[PDB]
Amino acid sequence: KGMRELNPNDIDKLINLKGLVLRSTPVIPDMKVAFFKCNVCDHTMAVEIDRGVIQEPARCERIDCNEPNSMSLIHNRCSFADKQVIKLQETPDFVPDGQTPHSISLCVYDELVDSCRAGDRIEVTGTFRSIPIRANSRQRVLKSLYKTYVDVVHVKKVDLAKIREVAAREDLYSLLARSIAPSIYELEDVKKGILLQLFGGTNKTFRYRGDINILLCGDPSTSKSQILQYVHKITPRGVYTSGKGSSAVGLTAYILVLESGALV
Amino acid sequence: ILSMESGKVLRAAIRLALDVIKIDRLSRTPRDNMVLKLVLNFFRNVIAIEPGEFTINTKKSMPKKGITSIDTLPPNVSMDDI
């Protein structure tokens, strides 16, 4: 169900949302067990955090000491879980297009931290949740309308035997060459050259690289752009752009921080 | 006392005692008897020094935290020195 459609009935239910990750926080430490050491007698005890509250011992546990207010929290001997917060956007595909997409914060925990990155379209399955937020951190006073977030429990994005069987074929050069773009005219010297570009060479660290670089010349009135489009789909981690008016810095890296351009 | 020149003053103390143990049981006068007793009191005291108890006034109530630490050593001493 859509992000725009969540309502107060959902507030304790499990839900599942499709959306786009805009960005994430770094990992945030969440205390799961507090560690209290006695200033008088150096005895130590452990307290599990209950609903975000430290159940502090008011007097020292040891009956032979039993001093009040003598326990103190030894921060780096407490035990911590991992938490991360991610801004998940309603996709521009699903919006009523005259107005903005929404977004929702989600909390993701432990080894589910860093399961996704900016630009990932994902599903997230989790409990819908709501919490109050303080009017001033110096006070208990809370604002009437709660903050909402989804507290996730699962995420998802959006062998060699077969490979060996094909490897023995005699037509394999042409077989792989046709496969890159069977919808386009067969042009198989171009397709074979691109196939070698997809294979690549090897590397040596003592400089050189195992790259391959190709230029499709010829008229503007031919299918080479469509070949490029299919190769951009085929490759695992490529990019597509065009060179007219392409800045030396826009293509490469641009300015505070420096951000990578298309080629990088 | 324990550290300085591997505590050579300890041998000074026993030598001071030895210089009345040499003479006869009777020849140790009341002053010699007292001197040997004072040497023993020296060794006893050097054993006996120990960190003091942190002793607090109880008229005024405790704050929201107790005593911050019981450590009563001076800054140039570690407990292993003692």
Binding site: C41, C65 | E53, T55, I56, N57, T58, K59, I70
Partner: peptide
């Protein structure tokens, strides 16, 4: 005299 209480490291 000053009413007071003694806290001892040896019971640590």
């Amino acid at each position: 005299s000053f009413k007071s209480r003694a806290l001892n490291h040896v019971k640590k």
